[PDB]
Design a protein around this nucleic acid. Structure first.
Lengths: 55, 117, 142, 110, 103, 150
RNA sequence: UGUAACGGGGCUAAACCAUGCACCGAAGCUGCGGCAGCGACGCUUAUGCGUUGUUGGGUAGGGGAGCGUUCUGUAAGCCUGCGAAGGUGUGCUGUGAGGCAUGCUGGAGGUAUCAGAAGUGCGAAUGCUGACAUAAGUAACGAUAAAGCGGGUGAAAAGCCC
RNA sequence: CCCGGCGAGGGGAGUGAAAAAGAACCUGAAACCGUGUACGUACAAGCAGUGGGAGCACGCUUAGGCGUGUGACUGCGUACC
C-alpha cells in the first residue's frame, strides 16, 4: 500500500511525460462565412458546409 | 543574555551546502544528506590520494611492459637489466619516454639487454 | 607534468586476420583478448579502447586438448520457469561455431561498456573467407 | 516592449494550468488564441483571458501591431493555498488545500 | 633536446625554456640553481643515458615563484564510533625556469 | 509556567512521542530548563587586597604622570562655566578631582560636566582611578589618602 | 530457483614436487617537503632560539590549547545615508573551529583591543511549532427514487426560474 | 485610461526617496515549485561519490595554455545515528 521511501522529482516528471494535452491540428474554414470551427461540427453562427442550419 | 542562534547556524549550513554543489538530488539541497555526502567525499578523497599513487604506477608499468615487448624483452628482464646497468630512471619517466620518443627507449632496451644477456 | 593519455579521436587502429585452424582454444583467445584491449601498444590507456580489429577465420577448426571436445559443457539460462539449457563442445561447434570463440573471448574481456565496444572489434567467421577485403587485413600469426 | 500580463490567485492548481500553458509557448498569438479557444479545459479560459489582456496591454499601452505578437514567456507559479478541514471516517480529521496559481504571459514582437 | 634529472626526491623531464614546479628549495626568488645530477640528455636521436648522473651536463634554471598548492582538506571519520577529524594542508613548491641543458 | 499537569495523549497507543505535560522545555510556549533566579553577584575582596590594589594604582598613577597634586582647588560660585574655564586653563580634558573635603559648591558645579567628577577621599574607588585620564587632588586629600591607606 | 565444490574465462599446463633467478605487490621502510609533542645539549634564561634523538591509529575516559555567538566596561570613543546590521555571490587566507576583503540587495545601525558574564554552538530524542513536499492529479465526490426537452435569465446553464 | 462579467486580477498614468514600500505592504532566508541558457543522457545495472579523463560551451591570455560549468568512459567504493 504505502511506499518504502518517497519518489524523486525526476521519477515524477518522467511519469508526467505522457500527460501532455494534444492540440487541435488546424481548425477548418467555412466556405461562405469564413469562420473557424472544428471538423464535422457546425460553426458558432450555425453554419455547416455552407448551409445555415440552426436559427 | 539570551543568545539566538539563527545567523551562526545558517552560516554553518551554507558552508556545508557549498561543498555539496553538484550532487544528485537531496544530496545537494537537503542539509542532512549533504552533510553525509560531504563527509564521505572527504573519506574518499583521502583514500584516493593513496590509490592515485598506486594506480599511476600500475599504468606506467603496463606501458613500459608494452613498449618493451615491442623491443623483444619483457618488463621483468628490462627492469633487472636496468638495475644491473645502474640507471636511476623511474617508471614515470620511462613510460613518458616509451610513448613520446621511441628512439631513447630502443637505446635503453639495448643497454639493458647488453647488461642482462 | 601529467602523464600521457590517449584520445579516442586520434587513435589509429589496425586490422588483422587470424587463421584459427588447428590451434588451442584458450591460448588463441588470450592472445585475441590481449590484442583487443590494446595492451600491446605503448600508448595504452585503461579507459580508451586502444586495440585493433581482428577477423578470426576458421572457427570450425579450433582444437581443445584432453577430453574437452565431448565434455566441456556450456551452460546458459533462459531466465524462465526452471529451464537451464546446456550444450557440450561438439554440438556447440556443429550448431553455432562462432559462439565458442566469442564466448571464450568475452569471458576474458573487462565488463562494462568499454569491454562491449572492444568485443565489437572482434569479427569471427567459420569459413576460410571473409568479406572484409576493403580494409586490408594483415596476417597476424600466433 | 515585452508587455507582461498576470492573473494572481487563479482558482486552479498550477499543474492543471501548466498543462495548457505548455500548449501555447512560443506560438504566434493568433494560433495561441484559437488553440486556447478550442481546448476543453477551464485552465484554457483562464489563460485565454490573461493572453487577451496581454494583447490589449500591448495594443493600448505601447505601440501597435496586433499580428506580430508571439507568446514568448508564459509561466505558472504556485500561489497561496487555503487550508480546509475534511471530516473522514472514525473521527479523524483531514486537511484539503484549495490550491491557487499565478499565471503570467509575456508577449512581444521579438 | 630534453633532459631527465632528479630534483626533490623524484625525477623530472625537461625542455629548454619550460617552467617546472618542483619541491621547495632554500633559494631566493631572483637567483639561479644548477642541478648537476642529470640522469639523461637526449638531443636528436643521440641519446646519452648514463651509469648514473652521466657526465658533464649541467641544468641551470632560474627561480621565479614560491607559492603554495591548492588547499587539501583531510577528513578522518570512523562511523558509529563518535570520532571525526578535520585538517587542512597546503604544500610549498618552487617554480624554476629552465634556461639551458649542457652537453 | 501556566498550564495544567494533564498528559496531552496516552502513554501507549498513538504514533506520537511520549509526553507528560505541555510545560516541558522541549515544547513551545512552556519552558526554561534551568531558569534564572535573582542572584547575588557580589564577591568578597580582602581588606588587605583592596588596600594593596589602591596602593598599586596610586604608585602607577604617579609613575605614569597622570597624577597632578594641587595646593588648593577653589571655585567660588556653583556655576559650571567657572569650573569649565578653570579646567581649560589647567589644560584638562578628562578629570577626576579628589578634593580633601566635598564642599557642596564645587560638587554642584561639576554635575553637568561629563568628563569631570568630584569625589571625597573616602569615595576613592579603583575603577574611577583607572577610568579618568588625569586624577587631580588637593594636598590635604593626598594626606587623607595616605593616612587612610598607609 | 540457475551452471554453482577454480571468483570467472579458460588451462593438459595456466596442475603438482623440487631447485633457482627476476619482477609485481601495503597507508610497512627509504627519499623529498611541512607541522606538532616529549627529552637531552648549548646560547643569556623577552621561560625563548638553535642542535640532536624519538614520538604522532584510537572508543570509554583523563589532560592541555583555542574559535565563534549574545550582553557589560573601555565607549558621549571609533566606523557608518559618498550606506550599518541582516541577505546573497566571488576572491583570498588560517592546522581547525574561522577570519578579511569586495559585487548586488537592504535602508539604520554596528563595534576594535583587552577584560567580564553565559538562556553560548543541534541532525537524530516515534523531540515541539510553523511552512512545504510525497503518494497523486491518484481514491473519492455520501443510498442504484430517474430523468428528457423547449423557453427565459445571464459573460456563461446538466443542476436556477417557468 | 485600457482588457475583463458596469468582476477578481492586471498593465499604464500619478503620489512618493523607494510601489521587486500597494494595504496578501520593512528585511525577505531555507525547504518546495517553475521558466530560460550551457553541457550530459534513450545497449546500459547497485550508498550516486571519489581518483583519472576525452569532448563540448563560455571567458580571457604572454597566443603556449589557464579558469568556470558539464562530464562520456574508467579504478576504487554496501548512508548516518
Amino acid at each position: 500500500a504505502v511506499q518504502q521511501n518517497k519518489p524523486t522529482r525526476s521519477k515524477r516528471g518522467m511519469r508526467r511525460s505522457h500527460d501532455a494535452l494534444t492540440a487541435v491540428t488546424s481548425l477548418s474554414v467555412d466556405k461562405t462565412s469564413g469562420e473557424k470551427h472544428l471538423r464535422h461540427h457546425i460553426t458558432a453562427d450555425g453554419y455547416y458546409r455552407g448551409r445555415k442550419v440552426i436559427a | 543574555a539570551r543568545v539566538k542562534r539563527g545567523v551562526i547556524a545558517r552560516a554553518r549550513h551554507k558552508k556545508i551546502l557549498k561543498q555539496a554543489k553538484g550532487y544528485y538530488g537531496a544530496r545537494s539541497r537537503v542539509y542532512r544528506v549533504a552533510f553525509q555526502a560531504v563527509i564521505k567525499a572527504g573519506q574518499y578523497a583521502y583514500r584516493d590520494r593513496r590509490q592515485r599513487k598506486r594506480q599511476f604506477r600500475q599504468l606506467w608499468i603496463a606501458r613500459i611492459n608494452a613498449a618493451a615487448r615491442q623491443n623483444g624483452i619483457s618488463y621483468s628482464k628490462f627492469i633487472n637489466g636496468l638495475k644491473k646497468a645502474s640507471v636511476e630512471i623511474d617508471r614515470k619517466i620511462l613510460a613518458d619516454i616509451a610513448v613520446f620518443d621511441k628512439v631513447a627507449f630502443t637505446a635503453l632496451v639495448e643497454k639493458a639487454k647488453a647488461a642482462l644477456a | 607534468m601529467k602523464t600521457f593519455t590517449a584520445k579516442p579521436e586520434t587513435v589509429k587502429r589496425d586490422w588483422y586476420v587470424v587463421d584459427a585452424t588447428g590451434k588451442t582454444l584458450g591460448r588463441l583467445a588470450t592472445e585475441l583478448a590481449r590484442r583487443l584491449r590494446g595492451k600491446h601498444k605503448a600508448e595504452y590507456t585503461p579507459h580508451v579502447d586502444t586495440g585493433d580489429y581482428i577477423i578470426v577465420l576458421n572457427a570450425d577448426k579450433v582444437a581443445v586438448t584432453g577430453n574437452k571436445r565431448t565434455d566441456k559443457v556450456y551452460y546458459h539460462h533462459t531466465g524462465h520457469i526452471g529451464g537451464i539449457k546446456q550444450a557440450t563442445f561438439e554440438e556447440m561447434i556443429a550448431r553455432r561455431p562462432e559462439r565458442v570463440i566469442e564466448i571464450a573471448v568475452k569471458g576474458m574481456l573487462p565488463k562494462g561498456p568499454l569491454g562491449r565496444a572492444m568485443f565489437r572489434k572482434l569479427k569471427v567467421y567459420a569459413g576460410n573467407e571473409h568479406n572484409h577485403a576493403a580494409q586490408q587485413p594483415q596476417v597476424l600469426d600466433i | 516592449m515585452e508587455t507582461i500580463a498576470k492573473h494572481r490567485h487563479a482558482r486552479s492548481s498550477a499543474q492543471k494550468v501548466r498543462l495548457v500553458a505548455d500548449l501555447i509557448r512560443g506560438k504566434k498569438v493568433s494560433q495561441a488564441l484559437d488553440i486556447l479557444t478550442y481546448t476543453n479545459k477551464k485552465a484554457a479560459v483562464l489563460v485565454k483571458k490573461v493572453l487577451e489582456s496581454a494583447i490589449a496591454n500591448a495594443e493600448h499601452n505601447d505601440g501597435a501591431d496586433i499580428d506580430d505578437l508571439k507568446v514568448t514567456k508564459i509561466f505558472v507559479d504556485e500561489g497561496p493555498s487555503m487550508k480546509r478541514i475534511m471530516p473522514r471516517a472514525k473521527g479523524r480529521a483531514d486537511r484539503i488545500l484549495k490550491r491557487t496559481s499565478h499565471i503570467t504571459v509575456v508577449v512581444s514582437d521579438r | 633536446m630534453y633532459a631527465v634529472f632528479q630534483s626533490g626526491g623524484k625525477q623530472h623531464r625537461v625542455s629548454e625554456g619550460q617552467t617546472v614546479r618542483l619541491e621547495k628549495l632554500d633559494i631566493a626568488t631572483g637567483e639561479t640553481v644548477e642541478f648537476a645530477e642529470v640522469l639523461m640528455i637526449a638531443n636528436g636521436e643521440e641519446v646519452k643515458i648514463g651509469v648514473p648522473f652521466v657526465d658533464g651536463g649541467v641544468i641551470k634554471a632560474e627561480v621565479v615563484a614560491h607559492g603554495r598548492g591548492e588547499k587539501v582538506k583531510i577528513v578522518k571519520f570512523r562511523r558509529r564510533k563518535h570520532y571525526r577529524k578535520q585538517q587542512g594542508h597546503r604544500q610549498w613548491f618552487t617554480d624554476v625556469k629552465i634556461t639551458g641543458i649542457s652537453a | 509556567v501556566t498550564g495544567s499537569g494533564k498528559k496531552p495523549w496516552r502513554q501507549k497507543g498513538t504514533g506520537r512521542a511520549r509526553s507528560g505535560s505541555i510545560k516541558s522545555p522541549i515544547w513551545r510556549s512552556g519552558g526554561v530548563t534551568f531558569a534564572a533566579r535573582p542572584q547575588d553577584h557580589s564577591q568578597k575582596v580582602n581588606k588587605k587586597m583592596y588596600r594593596g590594589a589602591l596602593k598599586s594604582i596610586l604608585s602607577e598613577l604617579v609613575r605614569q604622570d597622570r597624577l597632578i597634586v594641587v595646593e588648593k582647588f577653589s571655585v567660588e560660585a556653583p556655576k559650571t562655566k567657572l569650573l569649565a574655564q578653570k579646567l581649560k586653563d589647567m589644560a584638562l580634558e578628562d578629570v577626576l578631582i579628589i578634593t580633601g573635603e566635598l564642599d557642596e559648591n564645587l560638587f554642584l558645579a561639576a554635575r553637568n560636566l561629563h568628563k569631570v567628577d568630584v569625589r571625597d577621599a573616602t569615595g576613592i574607588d579603583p575603577v574611577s582611578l583607572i577610568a579618568f585620564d588625569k586624577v587631580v587632588m588637593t594636598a590635604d586629600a593626598v594626606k587623607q589618602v595616605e593616612e587612610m591607606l598607609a
